[PDB]
């Protein structure tokens, strides 16, 4: 018998993002080669497969640093880690290799997903 | 507000 | 020029819910008379005016114990932290003036906006 | 997806 609010999901998403941009209590940075990006954990989790099955780990649960594997392309984890916090995916003819190829790494479905079909419409 |  | 996913919110609201079901990365207990509930500081900080204001200051943000008014209902808090964690409000006759009175001590305006609505049509 |  509960009521819903309808906006209430996006607004809880609209100020994890603000934490995120005001660096509050964020427990994690994730290098990508030469880059850091500095994220929630819990964020991380519910985004990801991949960040789902490290931060579960009885250890890695743990490490306020955590690597990518040298192949992963800064900007790719860039405009995927801004889907996380905002819903918006930036897919550009210029990025998108780096951008499905990243999704995959991070188990990201529904981004690989309509990144295939993007590529499928342009051959 | 609305019944989900 | 972003694309959106509809459903990635609620999607990341319904994660942040089964990771406080299942107590991960929880960093705080709210105690709220004999009773005592287990959250995340960066959802409650995005759901409430009131631990907004306490987790960014720079003495409270490092508590992992807060005590609320002994005037606050146990059972109010609970139906307005499952709010926070799903969008669903459990809103009936017998809960409705406590959840009102609870709401207006988080600062959660959307909340106490329906619930004057609700009392206004039973008068 | 849509565009928003
Ligand atoms: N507790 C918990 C919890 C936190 N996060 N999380 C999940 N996170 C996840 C796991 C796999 C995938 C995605 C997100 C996006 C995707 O494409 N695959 C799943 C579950 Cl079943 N549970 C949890
Ligand atoms: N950074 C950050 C950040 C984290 N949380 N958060 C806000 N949380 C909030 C503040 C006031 C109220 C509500 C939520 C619900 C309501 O009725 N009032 C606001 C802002 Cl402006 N910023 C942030
Ligand atoms: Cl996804
Ligand atoms: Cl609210």
């Keep these: 018998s509960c009521i819903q609010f309808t906006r209430h999901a996006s607004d809880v998403l609209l100020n994890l993002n603000r934490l995120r941009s005001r660096d509050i209590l964020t427990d994690v940075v994730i290098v990508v080669s030469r880059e850091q990006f500095r994220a929630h954990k819990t964020v991380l989790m519910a985004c990801s497969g991949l960040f789902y099955s490290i931060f579960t780990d009885q250890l890695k649960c743990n490490l306020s640093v955590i690597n990518l594997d040298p192949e992963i392309n800064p900007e790719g984890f860039c405009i995927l880690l801004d889907f996380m916090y905002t819903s918006r995916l930036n897919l550009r003819e210029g990025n998108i290799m780096a951008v499905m190829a990243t999704a995959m790494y991070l188990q990201m479905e529904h981004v690989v997903d309509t990144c295939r079909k993007f590529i499928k419409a342009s051959e | ?4």
Excluded: G, N, T
Excluded at chain 2, 1 to 4: C, D, T
């Design chain 2, 1 to 4: 507000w609305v019944i989900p």
